[PDB]
Amino acid sequence: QFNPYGDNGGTILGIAGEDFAVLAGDTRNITDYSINSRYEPKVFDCGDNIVMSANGFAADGDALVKRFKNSVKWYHFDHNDKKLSINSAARNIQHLLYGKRFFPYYVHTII
Amino acid sequence: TQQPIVTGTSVISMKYDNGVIIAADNLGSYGSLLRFNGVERLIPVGDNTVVGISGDISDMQHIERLLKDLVTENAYDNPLADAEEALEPSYIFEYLATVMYQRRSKMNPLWNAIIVAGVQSNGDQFLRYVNLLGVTYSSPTLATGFGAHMANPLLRKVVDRESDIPKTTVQVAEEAIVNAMRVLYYRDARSSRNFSLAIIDKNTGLTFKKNLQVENMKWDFAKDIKGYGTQKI
Amino acid sequence: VSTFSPEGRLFQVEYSLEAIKLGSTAIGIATKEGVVLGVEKRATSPLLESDSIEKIVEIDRHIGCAMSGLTADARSMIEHARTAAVTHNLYYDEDINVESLTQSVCDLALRFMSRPFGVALLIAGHDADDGYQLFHAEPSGTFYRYNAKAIGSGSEGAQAELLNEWHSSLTLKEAELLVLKILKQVMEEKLDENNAQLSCITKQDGFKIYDNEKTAELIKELKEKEAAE
Amino acid sequence: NYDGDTVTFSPTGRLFQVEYALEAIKQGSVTVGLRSNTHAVLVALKRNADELSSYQKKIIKCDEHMGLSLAGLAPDARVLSNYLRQQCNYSSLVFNRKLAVERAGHLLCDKAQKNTQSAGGRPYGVGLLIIGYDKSGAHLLEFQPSGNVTELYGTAIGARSQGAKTYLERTLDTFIKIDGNPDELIKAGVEAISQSLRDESLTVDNLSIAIVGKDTPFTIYDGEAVAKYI
Amino acid sequence: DRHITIFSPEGRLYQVEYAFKATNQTNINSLAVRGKDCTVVISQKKVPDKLLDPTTVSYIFCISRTIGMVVNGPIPDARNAALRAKAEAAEFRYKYGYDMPCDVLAKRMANLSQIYTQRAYMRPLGVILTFVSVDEELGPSIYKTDPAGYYVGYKATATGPKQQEITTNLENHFKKSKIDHINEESWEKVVEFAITHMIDALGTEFSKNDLEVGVATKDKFFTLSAENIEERLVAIAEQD
Amino acid sequence: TIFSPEGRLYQVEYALESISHAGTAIGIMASDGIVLAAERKVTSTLLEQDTSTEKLYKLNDKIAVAVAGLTADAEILINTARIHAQNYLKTYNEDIPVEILVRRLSDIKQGYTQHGGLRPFGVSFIYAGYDDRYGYQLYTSNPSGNYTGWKAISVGANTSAAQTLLQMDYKDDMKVDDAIELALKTLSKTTDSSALTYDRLEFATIRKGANDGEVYQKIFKPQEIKDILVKTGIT
Amino acid sequence: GYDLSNSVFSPDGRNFQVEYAVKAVENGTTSIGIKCNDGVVFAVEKLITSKLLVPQKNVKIQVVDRHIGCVYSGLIPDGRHLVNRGREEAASFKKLYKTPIPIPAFADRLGQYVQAHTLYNSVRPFGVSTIFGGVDKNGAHLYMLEPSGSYWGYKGAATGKGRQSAKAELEKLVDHHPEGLSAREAVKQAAKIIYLAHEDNKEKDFELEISWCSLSETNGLHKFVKGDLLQEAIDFAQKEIN
Amino acid sequence: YSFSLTTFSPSGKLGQIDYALTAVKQGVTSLGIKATNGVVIATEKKSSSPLAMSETLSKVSLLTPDIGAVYSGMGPDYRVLVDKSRKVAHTSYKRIYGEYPPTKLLVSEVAKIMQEATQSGGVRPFGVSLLIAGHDEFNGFSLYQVDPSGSYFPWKATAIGKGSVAAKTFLEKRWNDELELEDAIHIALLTLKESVEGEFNGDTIELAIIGDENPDLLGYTGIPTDKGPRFRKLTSQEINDRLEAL
Amino acid sequence: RALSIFSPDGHIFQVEYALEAVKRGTCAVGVKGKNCVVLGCERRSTLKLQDTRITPSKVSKIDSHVVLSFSGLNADSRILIEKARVEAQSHRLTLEDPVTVEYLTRYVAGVQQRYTQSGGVRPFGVSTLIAGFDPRDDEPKLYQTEPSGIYSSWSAQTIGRNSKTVREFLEKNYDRKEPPATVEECVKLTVRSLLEVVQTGAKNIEITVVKPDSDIVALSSEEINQYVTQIEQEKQEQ
Ligand SMILES: [Mg+2]
Ligand SMILES: [Mg+2]
Ligand SMILES: [Mg+2]
Ligand SMILES: [Mg+2]
Structure with a gap:
């Protein structure tokens, strides 16, 4: 049978300081016991001073990041160029994820 | 939800200083039966892009058709459909990546692994992989199937990192690719002696080579090998 | 229903606007201390219980609106506005921008249902990016921001009086009196607490409809201020 | 008797409902477009209903490299620019490709066309000026609700458009050469828009400006930011 | 009442009447006759x-291997009827395992026309269709349908502006001959007869480019070339 | 389906008008039963009156209707009424109360009144039925979707004439045989024809048989009408 | 008003909405096609409304698939709608049958679609007349399609305001070249005929556009005539107009 | 076009049904006569030209092996109703009960189809009147007339179209409840002679009977419970035989 | 197909003409006491020989605590009453509370409004009076809806033919300061007001009393006839 999921490895880490935050990732991408790439970034600047990473099944992670970056674009279009606050990003990401509750994005997301 | 029937094996590729090289053999297997020997799995799109495909051949032929339509449609109402608004390697890839991920999302995949090799109009080498799950990645070398396991190790000895690319000439790169193809014919039971290779160079453009053969094969030592342990004659 | 005149206006939209001119007056004034909305009740009879006349409604804590015209047509707009403000809060953990809410109602308006709406709306609110705001939403699907505006049967007269009286430092209390005043002038009946209704939205307290006792006190204060010259 | 619907030709082969839709433009506040080889500019005088009212927004961003100005029914500009946002968005997501301005043109023409051919619907009642910077440089486009689109060095639409269209028709050789100079293209735009004024001296609320170019993403300038151009 | 296919006080359908008018727009005449084992259709070509x-420039259509059709009416409507009949004849074959007979296809197109007669949103087609074949059950066959939804089979027939002259000319040949077909073995002589009788009744002579001929034999319908038509014209020019 | 400036429904008014030309039908409600009588408009010697049915239809075992208006429109509505009865019986294991069936039919008519752009049915009904809640019941419905209940009523041609007579001769404590008589007399004086014969009549009764405890529906045969004509002195 | 709806036949068997559509065509810019010995050439008249139009930029000839040219006079948007549908119709033929669509086949596809819009009173006919063609497996073909859906094959064809001038010029070519006509020649001849036909419209100045599809000059692909060869033809037309 | 094209006028008339009846009025005359052991339906085969083939047109059609129909008014309208009627005899009846419907119920269904065309959106009423003759085990022989309104009624004898008025009259004189079928055929032939103008022979006259069971028209032997069709179209030769003995 | 459209003066004619059918409808009135609401309706005169046992009276129960009366097209009213009854049960089912009278009014008003702006439907030829008591509350309730979908509450109100007249009566006779503190003097005011238009009749006037906690009783011909007598006496005593 076709398995719609895979696992591309990697690991991500986020730390909040008083007036900064870091989000870090390794750049390695793997399938089973092979290396696909030694440099395939998976932490992204999303506009409005938000960084995002969606780690696990890279195909799913990419879809989600794409859909969120696009979310931000349309937020500017629909709300007179307003800056998307990090809490508002979070809630929006909840809805992206939950919309797929019965066929989920296999990723751990940090912003 | 399906199963691959007629199949193609490794597609391998690497970037060198002035472009990218991609190769793939000319076989279409039917399980263990080596059924079709004249199968082109490198698909040129314009004068700047080659798309190399492994996996299910029927799905491959579907992807061919899509790429020909992509060219036709791009020319519609486009005076510069072949200048500035000509199709780029990046565009062809993002198109296929999208399709692949949509098809897996509908539980009906195109049973393939695809490498898109080419040169962008600003001279940048383009090399990126996408498969039946919609997973995509880029590297200075890329290979699918057995190529992943055997060709990558050999090709990475020429280009281990990004900074190695300006150091690598067409001659060195083509030599590495030809050698890896020999190894694959040694160790891949679904491989073939005949293959195709294509170079896309920012100066020379696209050179497409058909009917190559693996040559300079070491078999001679076989005569000395008798039995499986104790047998002397 | 979707026909152009040779002047390039939409018959049904223009006639819709005529229906609005037949409606009770509604006035809004936007200050830096709040935005005031006032309306003319216009009971068709003394037996009608005037407190059952809902022509100023809450949309969200930070957004109110007054209507004028065929007011029955406004239920589905108010509903749509409420849903849109609440949904936005659900999807984004924040208050909808006033302009965005107005745009959404205007979007609904565009959707030519057999005919246009026979009602105009004054949408007043506050938000952090653009402060206090007033909007007029026509059944055309167009909306306009105003420092001050009046809609319904007394509008032409009222708009002129608003032209005179409005300045960019009107206190909220000043503005309330102005609404009462201009309503007193344009209403057929004598303005009292039972046939006129005041409301405001302040950042600190949101949208509040004034109760009759609080409105009466303002009517009284208005009469006394005018009997000086 | 022939102006009932768009599904009807007159005996002389005219479509009156389309012609009448074209008329709604002539009531729209004036707007001007013009381009050199490195930039494209929109200048749109906004109209106010009352002296207490906004001078309604006439410029809508479509992508980082594309946008438009409207004259006529604002709701219709919203339907069409929205469709343009989607179409530009689709080009990015699916092909990683910025949408060609010409290609936007053909898409609008086709959207407008359908509305000139089926019962129950009505032609769009808004004219649009479309600027963009793409892979072949700067571009200005004029859209008419009839579904006709044209590529121009400069133009104007709305009330008394003819004044600015005349000024630009002569200034052609002066502005087409304003390469690498942004502020001087906006100047030329503003200098063009006034040849169609009558009402007054264009004020800090009167004016709306939009620029896109070589290293300039499409940005709208309003108020305090446009003061230096009056 | 004169725009859509509702009844008029006299119980009439003006649109259908007007559709009959349109069938003459091209100012062409056609005629069909039956041989012993063939069927011929002739039409003017202008x-x-x-x-x-x-x-x-043609008004004759190969519908299937065995069925030809000639249209009297404007070409857009004629082609629309040809496509539908082609489509219909292929379907019949797939669903039923034998070739659509000529009269069944006629009946089917008639019924389609009848619908435009009855439903307001569809105008009738301004055409008359003559279907010809050698049927495997019935023999040489001619069936003709009009915008009313009417159809019938003919011994011979004619259509167009000078319909009536050709028709009576033909009735007259049959009164005298006492048979219901052209008693000739080769299709070449049936074509020759058909042209002759069209000349005798239009008061006109034909060169090779003024005509169009379709023949139906057992298991084939074909149209003649200008050259085969010339050979026909030569042979009549030694009789007449 | 539109309003006049006066607040009337064009197509409905015009449908009532259509009905006013249809053969007359009369319903009379007795103490121990109900009579249905109806006059066949347009007849001939050759029209087969034996195996015929055009104005009196069985809906159910406990309910019958008399029709004035377009016969074919009526069959449509009779058929859906028969089905509604059966759905009720399937659902509840009880025969449908007369009112409920009548309300349903009226609702269907009202529909054409208010939406869809289709012409109303050109039909009025008299309903005769029995149920265990209200016993004997007489109802009437017309194209407006309106329904009302009656002690006696008439529909179709000459209702003003027939109505006056019934009002004149009806009494609450009547018996079924008298109602049969009253029905025939009333049709006898409102006929647009020479004299009332058997071949121009349909006749039905609903009676709670004295020997049993259950209700019987009788649709009179041609010979049975002919007979009931002699007794009452119309020969 | 036997004209207030489409699917209505007038009492003389004509369709009144179609015949008004023709008026809109006659009202349009003139365009032509010339069949040559192994190809087809297309040309059109582009009215320079104003100095501000960017020259060579508002292209009006359109390719369908890779081997078919389309040009039209009338309501430009109606022409585009038709070409879009022509393209869907060509894709669906290729997808199913592999071979690119034969010109006769493509002609009937448009025919039928156009004809459909003369059948229902809720749709209006197309306000264009379209000239199109190309090279398929057996020859070059040229067609013209009228708002009724009527189409035929042509040796030469013209539509729009300058249509009779053009039709006369074309007839002179047919009569004086029974032998045939080279793609190269037809290109110049097209340029001439457009210039000549611009006389029935000589108020606004105009820009010339030509395209062609020839077996030996383009391998049987549709291409626009550009630079050198375009200028050569503009020169040839300028010369032989005096 | 989703609204009814047949509406009520202020006089309460339904215009389109009236106009349909007028079209029926212009139609060629057709008749039916019910005997004690049969029913006969008959009409004239108005050849539009002598080149047309008379036989190739069914004016009298078999609906089921025991039910026939004939018409007056618009031929093409009739032809689609025959098709829809045959199909409904199967979908609404034989596929449910494994026997063909009784005459009155088939007639009922046809009437339904015609009523619907009187009321559905975008359509005009059928411009025909049908005479439907048949037999079934429980009702015996019957004859019914169906009109554009969807109204139907049973007749002992009747006639429709052009010369109906006179023919109804002529039948009224000749009909008794004791007629044998051969007598009804003869009477039918007489009535038809009055309405017809030109030639009057077996090739201008179409007649069918609903009579006894015809075992030799069955197609197979073996099942004695099946006896075969009661409907029979008379041949051109069979009509002429009865004409010479006028 | 849009039937309810605007006219140049800004009027929806179909909605307007619907009001005319209400005007043509038999009269209905409601007045609300200190602890009651009373509803009264006149009876028609097209024919008389009817069976009153079975024929639907003019006041419909919606839930056990809410009633609805109407003037206008009888057939249109059934449809609104059905939908109201369905909503009443649906509100209980999802909110575990019966409808407030105001909520049931807003619902019905909404339905009427909806039919003023949908293709292919004509507005309701109906105006309603809707009366009752909120659950666990004693303050009386009375509301009016009209074909446009407007609604509001009334100390007292009348609709239908000659409502013009009877509104005049109530406007001077109903004292807001002193609502008819008895069920009795509430029926009295309701009978007086109907008498002005009815032209004497016991089988003409019908009355229904609604008290708190689902207490709703129809009166009898004779029970009303008692009020008929005492009112015609006190007027003839002057
Ligand atoms: Mg926020
Ligand atoms: Mg029709
Ligand atoms: Mg039509
Ligand atoms: Mg011409």
Whole structure:
């Protein structure tokens, strides 16, 4: 049978300081016991001073990041160029994820 | 939800200083039966892009058709459909990546692994992989199937990192690719002696080579090998 | 229903606007201390219980609106506005921008249902990016921001009086009196607490409809201020 | 008797409902477009209903490299620019490709066309000026609700458009050469828009400006930011 | 009441009447006759414009291997009827395992026309269709349908502006001959008869480019070339 | 389906008008039963009156209707009424109360009144039925979707004439045989024809048989009408 | 008003909405096609409304698939709608049958679609007349399609305001070249005929556009005539107009 | 076009049904006579030209092996109703009960189809009147007339179209409840002679009977419970035989 | 197909003409006491020989605590009453509370409004009076809806033919300061007001009393006839 999921490895880490935050990732991408790439970034600047990473099944992670970056674009279009606050990003990401509750994005997301 | 029937094996590729090289053999297997020997799995799109495909051949032929339509449609109402608004390697890839991920999302995949090799109009080498799950990645070398396991190790000895690319000439790169193809014919039971290779160079453009053969094969030592342990004659 | 005149206006939209001119007056004034909305009740009879006349409604804590015209047509707009403000809060953990809410109602308006709406709306609110705001939403699907505006049967007269009286430092209390005043002038009946209704939205307290006792006190204060010259 | 619907030709082969839709433009506040080889500019005088009212927004961003100005029914500009946002968005997501301005043109023409051919619907009642910077440089486009689109060095639409269209028709050789100079293209735009004024001296609320170019993403300038151009 | 296919106080359908009028717009006449074991259709061919490619100007259509059709009416409507009948004849074959007979296809197109007669949103087609074949059950066959939804089979028939003259000419040949067909073995002589009787009744002579001929035999319908038509014209020019 | 400036429904008014030309039908409600009588408009010697049915239809075992208006429109509505009865019986294991069936039919008519752009049915009904809640019941419905209940009523041609007579001769404590008589007399004086014969009549009764405890529906045969004509002195 | 709806036949068997559509065509810019010995050439008249139009930029000839040219006079948007549908129709033929669509086949596809819009009173006919063609497996073909859906094959064809001038010129070519005509020649001849036909419209100045599809000059692909060869033809037309 | 094209006028008339009846009025005359052991339906085969083939047109059609129909008014309208009627005899009846419907119920269904065309959106009423003759085990022989309104009624004898008025009259004189079928055929032939103008022979006259069971028209032997069709179209030769003995 | 459209003066004619059918409808009135609401309706005169046992009276129960009366097209009213009854049960089912009278009014008003702006439907030829008591509350309730979908509450109100007249009566006779503190003097005011238009009749006037906690009783011909007598006496005593 076709398995719609895979696992591309990697690991991500986020730390909040008083007036900064870091989000870090390794750049390695793997399938089973092979290396696909030694440099395939998976932490992204999303506009409005938000960084995002969606780690696990890279195909799913990419879809989600794409859909969120696009979310931000349309937020500017629909709300007179307003800056998307990090809490508002979070809630929006909840809805992206939950919309797929019965066929989920296999990723751990940090912003 | 399906199963691959007629199949193609490794597609391998690497970037060198002035472009990218991609190769793939000319076989279409039917399980263990080596059924079709004249199968082109490198698909040129314009004068700047080659798309190399492994996996299910029927799905491959579907992807061919899509790429020909992509060219036709791009020319519609486009005076510069072949200048500035000509199709780029990046565009062809993002198109296929999208399709692949949509098809897996509908539980009906195109049973393939695809490498898109080419040169962008600003001279940048383009090399990126996408498969039946919609997973995509880029590297200075890329290979699918057995190529992943055997060709990558050999090709990475020429280009281990990004900074190695300006150091690598067409001659060195083509030599590495030809050698890896020999190894694959040694160790891949679904491989073939005949293959195709294509170079896309920012100066020379696209050179497409058909009917190559693996040559300079070491078999001679076989005569000395008798039995499986104790047998002397 | 979707026909152009040779002047390039939409018959049904223009006639819709005529229906609005037949409606009770509604006035809004936007200050830096709040935005005031006032309306003319216009009971068709003394037996009608005037407190059952809902022509100023809450949309969200930070957004109110007054209507004028065929007011029955406004239920589905108010509903749509409420849903849109609440949904936005659900999807984004924040208050909808006033302009965005107005745009959404205007979007609904565009959707030519057999005919246009026979009602105009004054949408007043506050938000952090653009402060206090007033909007007029026509059944055309167009909306306009105003420092001050009046809609319904007394509008032409009222708009002129608003032209005179409005300045960019009107206190909220000043503005309330102005609404009462201009309503007193344009209403057929004598303005009292039972046939006129005041409301405001302040950042600190949101949208509040004034109760009759609080409105009466303002009517009284208005009469006394005018009997000086 | 022939102006009932768009599904009807007159005996002389005219479509009156389309012609009448074209008329709604002539009531729209004036707007001007013009381009050199490195930039494209929109200048749109906004109209106010009352002296207490906004001078309604006439410029809508479509992508980082594309946008438009409207004259006529604002709701219709919203339907069409929205469709343009989607179409530009689709080009990015699916092909990683910025949408060609010409290609936007053909898409609008086709959207407008359908509305000139089926019962129950009505032609769009808004004219649009479309600027963009793409892979072949700067571009200005004029859209008419009839579904006709044209590529121009400069133009104007709305009330008394003819004044600015005349000024630009002569200034052609002066502005087409304003390469690498942004502020001087906006100047030329503003200098063009006034040849169609009558009402007054264009004020800090009167004016709306939009620029896109070589290293300039499409940005709208309003108020305090446009003061230096009056 | 004169725009859509509702009844008029006299119980009439003006649109259908007007559709019959349109069938004459091209100012062409056709005729069909039956041989012993063939069926022939002749139609005038008029290429006014010198700019036209004459080979593309035709009003005869191969519907299936065995069935041909000639239309009297404007070409857009004629082609629309040809496509539908082609489509219909292929379907019949797939669903039923034998070739659609000529009269069944006639009946089917008739019923389609009848619908435009009855439903307001569809105008009738301004055409008359003559279907010809050698049927495997019935023999040489001619069936003709009009915009009313009417159809019937004919011994012979004619259609167009001078319909009536051709028809009576033909009735007259049959009164005398006492048979219901052209008693000739080869299709070449049946075509020759058909042309002769069209000459005798239009008061006109034909060159090779003024006609169009379709023949139906057992298991084939074909149209003649200008050259085969010339050979026909030569042979009549030794009788008449 | 539109309003006049006066607040009337064009197509409905015009449908009532259509009905006013249809053969007359009369319903009379007795103490121990109900009579249905109806006059066949347009007859001939050759029209087969034996195996015929055009104005009196069985809906159910406990309910019958008399029709004035377009016969074919009526069959449509009779058929859906028969089905509604059966759905009720399937659902509840009880025969449908007369009112409920009548309300349903009226609702269907009202529909054409208010939406869809289709012409109303050109039909009025008299309903005769029995149920265990209200016993004997007489109802009437017309194209407006309106329904009302009656002690006696008439529909179709000459209702003003027939109505006056019934009002004149009806009494609450009547018996079924008298109602049969009253029905025939009333049709006898409102006929647009020479004299009332058997071949121009349909006749039905609903009676709670004295020997049993259950209700019987009788649709009179041609010979049975002919007979009931002699007794009452119309020969 | 036997004209207030489409699917209505007038009492003389004509369709009144179609015949008004023709008026809109006659009202349009003139365009032509010339069949040559192994190809087809297309040309059109582009009215320079104003100095501000960017020259060579508002292209009006359109390719369908890779081997078919389309040009039209009338309501430009109606022409585009038709070409879009022509393209869907060509894709669906290729997808199913592999071979690119034969010109006769493509002609009937448009025919039928156009004809459909003369059948229902809720749709209006197309306000264009379209000239199109190309090279398929057996020859070059040229067609013209009228708002009724009527189409035929042509040696030469013209539509729009300058149509009779053009039609006369074309007739002179047909008569004086029974032998045939080279793609190269037809290109110049097209340029001439457009210039000549611009006389029935000589108020606004105009820009010329030509395209062609020839077996030996383009391998049987549709291409626009550009630079050198375009200028050569503009020159040839300028010369032989005096 | 989703609204009814047949509406009520202020006089309460339904215009389109009236106009349909007028079209029926212009139609060629057709008749039916019910005997004690049969029913006969008959009409004239108005050849539009002598080149047309008379036989190739069914004016009298078999609906089921025991039910026939004939018409007056618009031929093409009739032809689609015959098709829809045959199909409904199967979908609404034989596929449910494994026997063909009784005459009155088939007639009922046809009437339904015609009523619907009187009321559905975008359509005009059928411009025909049908005479439907048949037999079934429980009702015996019957004859019914169906009109554009969807109204139907049973007749002992009747006639429709052009010369109906006179023919109804002529039948009224000749009909008794004791007629044998051969007598009804003869009477039918007489009535038809009055309405017809030109030639009057077996090739201008179409007649069918609903009579006894015809075992030799069955197609197979073996099942004695099946006896075969009661409907029979008379041949051109069979009509002429009865004409010479006028 | 849009039937309810605007006219140049800004009027929806179909909505307007619907009001005319209400005007043509038999009269209905409601007045609300200190602890009651009373509803009264006149009876028609097209024919008389009817069976009153079975024929639907003019006041419909919606839930056990809410009633609805109407003037206008009888057939249109059934449809609104059905939908109201369905909503009443649906509100209980999802909110575990019966409808407030105001909520049931807003619902019905909404339905009427909806039919003023949908293709292919004509507005309701109906105006309603809707009366009752909120659950666990004693303050009386009375509301009016009209074909446009407007609604509001009334100390007292009348609709239908000659409502013009009877509104005049109530406007001077109903004292807001002193609502008819008895069920009795509430029926009295309701009978007086109907008498002005009815032209004497016991089988003409019908009355229904609604008290708190689902207490709703129809009166009898004779029970009303008692009020008929005492009112015609006190007027003839002057
Ligand atoms: Mg926020
Ligand atoms: Mg029709
Ligand atoms: Mg039509
Ligand atoms: Mg011409």
